[PDB]
Amino acid sequence: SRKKMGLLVMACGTPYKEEDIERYYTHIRRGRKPEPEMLQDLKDRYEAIGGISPLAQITEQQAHNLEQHLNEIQDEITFKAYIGLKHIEPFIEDAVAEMHKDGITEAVSIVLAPHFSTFSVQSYNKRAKEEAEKLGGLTITSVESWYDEPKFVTYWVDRVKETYASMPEDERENAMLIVSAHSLPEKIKEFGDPYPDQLHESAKLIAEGAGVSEYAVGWQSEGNTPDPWLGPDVQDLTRDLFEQKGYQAFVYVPVGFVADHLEVLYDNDYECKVVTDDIGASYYRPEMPNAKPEFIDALATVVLKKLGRV
Ligand SMILES: *Cc1c(C)c(=O)n2c(=O)c(C)c(C)n12
Ligand SMILES: [Cl-]
Ligand SMILES: [Cl-]
Ligand SMILES: [Cl-]
Ligand SMILES: [Cl-]
Ligand SMILES: [Cl-]
Ligand SMILES: [Fe+2]
Ligand SMILES: [Fe+2]
Ligand SMILES: [Fe+2]
Ligand SMILES: [Fe+2]
Ligand SMILES: [Fe+2]
Ligand SMILES: [Mg+2]
Ligand SMILES: [Mg+2]
């Protein structure tokens, strides 16, 4: 009959309620509890973007919809989704342990971040595989990147085309597309990490499919460590390009992110919008994929291609 396979869907995680902010950020900060002013700031930011709990639901919806779509579009494998998160329960290791307890012996994994990096994707995949090895009798084949899946490129291409079509003529003629992902420490370059190259390729593919000749690649959401992070940051890039050529509209495609979270709804829709409001340009940031059918179909195609079934 149908072969059973685990579908390990991995992501960063989000707090589930305001009282989870402390523990989630302590985890991201490697055990350093945020000071009270930062905790208050973070709560205010989540309030300003409409609340925490919707953000927390998106990953679950993505995993659910992906499982059901994969099971509909082919007839050989029955997938069961398990969510494994980096910074809050259910953790990657919990998910693998659950797959093992449930009798899964073969799984495929995907990280809900389309570009490979050594800091994120490789670390999630290594955590999942090490837990599988420790438990024994369960193997995981892991997607490493998927930014170049044509269906995923097309998601963003069509959103960009719609945004440009929506602009008044003077904006459309004097607009800049900024394509971004989460910054990482610059030291990843010592490993030959392809993350920057893959962001630039994402940007090339999206601008090309959308027919957008003027675009730039930037990074966002860098951390505070003395070591440099990848730049330029989108806020500085926006101002710099404005000072160079006077763009009247900036379109932000944070292609490294697949769902609403603070690092889009705040780091673009507030922090970049501050800059565009200051320089008098219009701000546009098309919808994140979230759990939209077009994006789920792209992910399902990524998974089936990884398994050689397409
Ligand atoms: C840790 C964290 C925060 C605060 C945020 O907004 N996001 C994302 O969008 C990702 C992918 C991660 C991780 N985080
Ligand atoms: Cl990997
Ligand atoms: Cl891959
Ligand atoms: Cl890769
Ligand atoms: Cl949109
Ligand atoms: Cl859709
Ligand atoms: Fe409460
Ligand atoms: Fe459903
Ligand atoms: Fe479907
Ligand atoms: Fe560049
Ligand atoms: Fe971050
Ligand atoms: Mg590839
Ligand atoms: Mg920041």
From Swiss-Prot:
pH dependency: Optimum pH is 7.2 with Zn(2+) and protoporphyrin IX as substrates.
Binding residues for Fe-coproporphyrin III: 12, 29, 45-46, 53, 124
UniProt catalytic activity: Fe-coproporphyrin III + 2 H(+) = coproporphyrin III + Fe(2+)
GO MF term (any one): metal ion binding
Record's function text: Involved in coproporphyrin-dependent heme b biosynthesis. Catalyzes the insertion of ferrous iron into coproporphyrin III to form Fe-coproporphyrin III. It can also insert iron into protoporphyrin IX. Has weaker activity with 2,4 disulfonate, deuteroporphyrin and 2,4 hydroxyethyl. In vitro, can also use Zn(2+) or Cu(2+).
Subunit: Monomer. Interacts with frataxin/Fra.
HAMAP family the record matches: Ferrochelatase (MF_00323)
Identification of the protein by name: Coproporphyrin III ferrochelatase
Origin species: Bacillus subtilis (strain 168)
